[PDB]
């Protein structure tokens, strides 16, 4: 009724829902690495690099609790670009790269993807599709004249390019070459940091880049692993790849470098468990069109339910394993159940007689309301007739009937026309 937006329903078969086997368990697996990454040896490192010759540390083979770093209120910004910082503890990465440098605090605005500014042009450039976080804080304890940045260049530098060229850049043709002069300038100069400077004051900056390759992961959040379940519909997470499905033991001949497998559709089809080299197959939890078989509501409120393509052994637990309600699970746990090539049919009596097809089901099955209950049967193609042929017998009509058979044909639609401007813009 609610599918048709109507209080009356005509005799027929109607699709109304898609049935889905709901998962019963949640599994989390990661490599069991005991090491904690040395972020103190970054944010509390003694003295940071310049912006012209910034320092990169690859960070690896550990657990990391980024929520601790995110809670460090000294950080005046913690902005993130392809991730939201609260989510970091849920993930695992194939590498992390931390970039460390110092600037005057006003320049922090330049440390972002695709921006304009001399730091972005000549010192430190993120690609326009960067995935990571930017972290910065004031550092007047560093106040000092060592902190170089680049004021000119012959061209802008590339994404993650770096340039330790200490040349006297010839802005013109003149090869002044070892001493500065007109159109020939030394391109590095340094901030004079003192507490008497606020955007002119020393600030520490760290940029974290994350790596998300197809290879096995390397830096994981603190989320503790749990045990494994087979032949049941489960929610799952391996290394931060996530879904729901029937896991199984599997025979697939993975070569030792291959971490997970894919089907003809490129869908994820198998995985290797991060704590044990067994290959697990992944299969979808069963689903299929729910259709309701009904005589007209003018004749009965009895119905049958067809779970299309679903095997009858998977249906009955739909008490919690589908979108049901208490009276609706009677069409799951009780009554008659009948397997057909079209799917599992529930609430109709299988019959060994055959009749003309009243309501069609599929694969030669039809259903009807008869002596009363809904029945299901194989449809009948009409009475059999052995024609009395022989090489010398003929039959000739002795009489006839006129007949008058009605035939109906469509000829015209209604001549609708629509003003698109008045429909769209009112």
């Amino acid at each position: 009724k609610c599918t048709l937006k109507s209080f009356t329903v005509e005799k027929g078969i109607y699709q109304t829902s898609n049935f889905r086997v709901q998962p019963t368990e949640s599994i989390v697996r990661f490599p069991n690495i005991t090491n904690l990454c040395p972020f103190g040896e970054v944010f509390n490192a003694t003295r940071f690099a310049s912006v012209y010759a910034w320092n990169r540390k690859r960070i690896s083979n550990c657990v990391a609790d980024y929520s601790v770093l995110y809670n460090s209120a000294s950080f005046s910004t913690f902005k993130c670009y392809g991730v939201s910082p609260t989510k970091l503890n849920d993930l695992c990465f194939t590498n992390v790269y931390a970039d460390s440098f110092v600037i005057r605090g006003d320049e922090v605005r330049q440390i972002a993807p695709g921006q304009t500014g001399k730091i972005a042009d000549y010192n430190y450039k993120l690609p326009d599709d960067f995935t990571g976080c930017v972290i910065a804080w004031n550092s007047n304890n560093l106040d000092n004249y060592n902190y170089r940045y680049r004021l000119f260049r012959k061209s802008n530098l590339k994404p993650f390019e770096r340039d330790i060229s200490t040349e006297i850049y010839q802005a013109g043709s003149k090869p002044c070459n070892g001493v500065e002069g007109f159109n020939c300038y030394f391109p590095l100069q340094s901030y004079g940091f003192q507490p008497t400077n606020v955007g002119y004051q020393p600030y520490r900056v760290v940029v974290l880049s994350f790596e998300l390759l197809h290879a096995p992961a390397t830096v994981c959040g603190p989320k503790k692993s749990t045990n494994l379940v087979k032949n049941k519909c489960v929610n799952f997470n391996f290394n931060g790849l996530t879904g729901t499905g029937v896991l199984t033991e599997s025979n697939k001949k993975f070569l030792p470098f291959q971490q997970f497998g894919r089907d003809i559709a490129d869908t994820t089809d198998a995985v290797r468990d991060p704590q044990t080299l067994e290959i697990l197959d992944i299969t979808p939890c069963s689903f299929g069109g729910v259709s309701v078989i009904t005589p007209g509501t003018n004749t009965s409120n009895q119905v049958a339910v067809l779970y299309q393509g679903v095997n009858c052994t998977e249906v009955p637990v739909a008490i919690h394993a589908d979108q049901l309600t208490p009276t609706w699970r009677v069409y799951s746990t009780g009554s008659n159940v009948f397997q057909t090539r079209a799917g599992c049919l529930i609430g109709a009596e299988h019959v060994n007689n055959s009749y003309e097809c009243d309501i069609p089901i599929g694969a030669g099955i039809c259903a009807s309301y008869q002596t009363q209950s809904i029945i299901a049967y194989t449809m009948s193609l009409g009475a059999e007739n052995s024609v009395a042929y022989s090489n010398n017998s003929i039959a000739i009509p002795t009489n006839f009937t006129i007949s008058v058979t009605t035939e109906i044909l469509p000829v015209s639609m209604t001549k609708t026309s629509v003003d698109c401007t008045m429909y769209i813009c009112g």
Partner: protein
């Protein structure tokens, strides 16, 4: 339920227009689906962003309606071409084409008007009460073989 063909021409068009009309109430991710809300509540510089979502959704809604009506009109035209043919062959003549003008052998037919369509009353001969007989393909009278004209 005999007129199920003609009643479908009515129902399919009623569903097409009601779906086209109800889509005016959809938000498509705009602030509200009534344009006078946006135009009252918001400055032009913001309202353009909302109004372009309504234009994008309403235009796609209308393109889908017109495209389905082009396909449905071709189906109705196939029926009009068949009806024009049955009127030329069955009414204005006597068709010798099996099962074209109803089951049995065609004698004649009569057209009747109907809402959005046409109805033919096909008058046909049907043979009705046979008996068995012995038969042979030729008769030899004196040596000459005879066949029926």
């Amino acid at each position: 339920s005999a007129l199920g063909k003609l009643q479908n021409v009515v129902n399919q068009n009623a569903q097409a227009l009601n779906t086209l009309v109800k889509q005016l109430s959809s938000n498509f991710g705009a602030i509200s689906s009534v344009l006078n809300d946006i135009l009252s509540r918001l400055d032009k510089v913001e309202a353009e962003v909302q109004i372009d979502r309504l234009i994008t959704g309403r235009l796609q809604s209308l393109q889908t309606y017109v495209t389905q009506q082009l396909i449905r009109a071709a189906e109705i035209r196939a029926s009009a071409n068949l009806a024009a043919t049955k009127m030329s062959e069955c009414v204005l003549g006597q068709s010798k084409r099996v099962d074209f003008c109803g089951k049995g052998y065609h004698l004649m037919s009569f057209p009747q008007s109907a809402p959005h369509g046409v109805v033919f009353l096909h008058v046909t001969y049907v043979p009705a009460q046979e008996k068995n007989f012995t038969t042979a393909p030729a008769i030899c009278h004196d040596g000459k073989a005879h066949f029926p004209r």
